[PDB]
Ligand binder design. Structure first.
Ligand SMILES: OC[C@H]1O[C@@](CO)(O[C@H]2O[C@H](CO)[C@@H](O)[C@H](O)[C@H]2O)[C@@H](O)[C@@H]1O
Ligand SMILES: OC[C@H]1O[C@@](CO)(O[C@H]2O[C@H](CO)[C@@H](O)[C@H](O)[C@H]2O)[C@@H](O)[C@@H]1O
Ligand SMILES: [Mg+2]
Length: 580
DNA sequence: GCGATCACGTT
DNA sequence: GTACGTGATCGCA
């Protein structure tokens, strides 16, 4: 049964009450400089639909939008805030974001529209966005009558769902998590996205030349060594050449054919010279397709900046994700790829890039949560944790630790955080399963606190049905009770890892909020550009570097107080690559 | 035009 | 063994 609402041709005073559910619709997935197709307002006086041209040109409405005392309840306020920033309009007073509330209540639901969130509370008087707009090539904004009813219904759902969601958040002790952490972070992320990062396109185009050239050489070398030409980018075609024509040994299978992953190829290299060339081709081709051509496709031609979109309500652990482009996976490990970062430059003349990253935050959080005496003392002495672990598991003094012993202790440390598995560690170190189990057993002997935590957290997950982080974020793990060994085992690793990865996420999010408050108090022009899970990237005038060198690390180190210190390394330079 | 696979980049 | 996003190929319209 249709929903009553006024299709306003002009903005009236009752539309500007100090409390309302607000819908500022942006249909385009990427909301940067995107159109706002309609507006809906629901308050004590009724339900309204306003045409964007009308509303956004009305002085009273714009003032209402920017008045922090006029509270708004929305779904994905960041989308609206950024679309409005591009139109030179400021959105303030958003006191409740249904998307973030739904996300905190249960990240697993994958709530991506008002309808999905509403379903959580048995409210179904609203259609999924996809049913209204369609998807793919058939996506499109419907006629006004249909559009207006959909927006009003979403505003109505939001108006109705606010109390129920806040009630459950409070019961879960997650009310401060939404109000003091996620919602304020949303506004910071919006400023970061809108600001964007400047890209030196000329530098990228030149790198693309060099790559395309040497890639052509390796491509030919590969055909010579194979005795014919084929699509190297085709796992199927490549498998034929390697495991059939060249008779290379099949050490690993995928499921539709042979595995040609770098992990396997590394082992096959000694058998034929084609393997190394294929690996090199794989490296170059990745940089060319994903980072050179890929970036160049999303740089704004007018400003030469890339404007990422941080998905704040997607990961099951509380970490942010980044898209179009994904700026949280720009090469750093290998030098050839690392040079891609020379393309990310300050947006203004005489400004520099400043980056600060937490050193081993996940292992430090683990030491804190597990209260492992050995591990806490190690960080208190600021020891090389990998060398210390090698010393303990292999029972030797520091001087007796060989590089290979450190490499393996390091691999054990990463496994411990991800949810240690004798099978997973074995694959990682290319060793026996029994040998891996022995390393793990030795580790727990040295860190009884970590062992106790791993055992206790799994039982707690089974008892309560979920695990939590420092700031009360939670992740339900129903598979923890499954009778299928594999399904259950994965759930157990999640129980071990989520509190760690999750608490590290909580901490850096808090540091971001604290940092922005400090920057404003000090009236610095410095501002956040990106966040890559455990690090923060900013840009600022060169004259602000010395101050940032003290301010940024301190804010990040003081975000939360743990049983062990939090350590922050920092660097700055003319490009992201130089901020090393 | 789409979606399941494959691969590989980050933490 | 965590947690992600993107690109090339290929089976099917
Ligand atoms: O606006 C980001 C916010 O929107 C959701 C809602 O579905 O995702 C949409 O927008 C993202 C950014 O363009 C896309 O990656 C995604 O595919 C699209 O559905 C939320 O998941 C997200 O938090
Ligand atoms: O019990 C020994 C040891 O086994 C683990 C393996 O992850 O858990 C198994 O045994 C528990 C009983 O103590 C069950 O609750 C759990 O479901 C089963 O997988 C460890 O957690 C535990 O320390
Ligand atoms: Mg680091």
């Amino acid at each position: 049964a249709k929903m009553a609402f006024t299709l306003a041709d002009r903005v009236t005073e009752e539309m500007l009450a100090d409390k309302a559910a607000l819908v500022v619709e942006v249909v385009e997935e990427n909301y940067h400089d995107a159109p706002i197709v309609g507006i809906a307002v629901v308050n004590e006086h009724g339900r309204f639909f306003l045409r964007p041209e009308t509303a956004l040109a009305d002085p009273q409405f714009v003032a209402w939008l920017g008045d922090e005392t006029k509270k708004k309840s929305m779904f994905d306020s960041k989308r609206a805030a950024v679309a409005l920033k591009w139109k030179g309009i400021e959105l303030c007073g958003v006191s409740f974001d249904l998307l973030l509330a739904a996300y905190l209540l249960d990240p697993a639901q994958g709530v991506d529209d008002v309808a999905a969130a509403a379903k959580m509370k048995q409210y179904e008087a609203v259609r999924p966005d996809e049913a209204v707009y369609g998807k793919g090539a058939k996506r499109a904004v419907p006629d006004e009558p249909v559009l207006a009813e959909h927006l009003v219904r979403k505003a109505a759902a939001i108006w109705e769902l606010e109390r129920p969601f806040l009630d459950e958040l409070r019961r879960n002790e997650q009310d401060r998590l939404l109000v003091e952490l996620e919602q304020p972070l949303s506004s910071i992320l919006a400023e970061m996205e809108f600001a964007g990062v400047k890209v030196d396109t000329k530098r990228l185009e030149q790198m693309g030349k060099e790559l395309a050239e040497q890639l052509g050489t390796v491509e030919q070398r590969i055909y010579e060594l194979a005795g014919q030409e084929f699509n190297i980018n085709s796992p199927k075609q490549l498998g034929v050449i390697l495991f059939e024509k060249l008779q290379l040994p099949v050490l690993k299978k995928t499921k539709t054919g042979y595995s040609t992953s770098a992990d396997v190829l590394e082992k096959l290299a000694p058998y034929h010279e084609i393997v190394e060339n294929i690996l090199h081709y794989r490296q170059l081709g990745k940089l060319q397709s994903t980072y050179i051509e890929g970036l160049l496709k999303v740089v704004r031609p007018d400003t030469k900046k890339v404007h990422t979109i941080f998905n704040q309500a997607l990961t099951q652990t509380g970490r942010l994700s980044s898209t179009e482009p994904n700026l949280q996976n720009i090469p750093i490990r290998l030098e050839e790829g690392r040079k891609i970062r020379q393309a990310f430059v300050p947006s203004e003349s005489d400004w520099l890039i400043f980056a600060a990253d937490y050193s081993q935050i996940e292992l430090r959080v683990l030491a804190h949560i597990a209260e492992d005496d050995n591990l806490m003392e190690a960080f208190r002495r600021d020891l090389d944790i990998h060398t210390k672990t090698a010393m303990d598991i292999f029972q030797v003094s520091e001087d007796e630790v060989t590089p290979n012993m450190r490499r393996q202790a390091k691999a054990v440390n990463f496994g411990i955080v991800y949810g240690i598995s004798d099978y997973g560690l074995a694959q990682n170190l290319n060793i026996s399963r029994k040998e891996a189990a022995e390393f793990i057993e030795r580790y727990f002997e040295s860190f009884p606190g970590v062992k106790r935590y791993m055992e206790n957290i799994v039982q707690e997950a089974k008892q309560k049905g979920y695990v939590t982080t420092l700031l009360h974020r939670r992740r339900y793990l129903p598979d923890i009770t499954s009778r299928n060994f594999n399904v259950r085992s994965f759930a157990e690793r999640m129980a071990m890892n989520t509190p760690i990865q999750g608490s590290a996420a909580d901490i850096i999010k808090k540091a971001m909020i604290d940092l922005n408050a400090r920057l404003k108090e000090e009236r610095l022009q410095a501002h956040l550009l990106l966040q890559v899970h455990d690090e923060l990237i900013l840009e600022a005038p060169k004259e602000e570097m010395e101050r940032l060198c003290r301010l940024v690390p301190e804010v990040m180190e003081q975000a939360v107080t743990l049983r062990v210190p939090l350590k922050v390394d920092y660097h700055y330079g003319s490009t992201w690559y130089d901020a090393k």
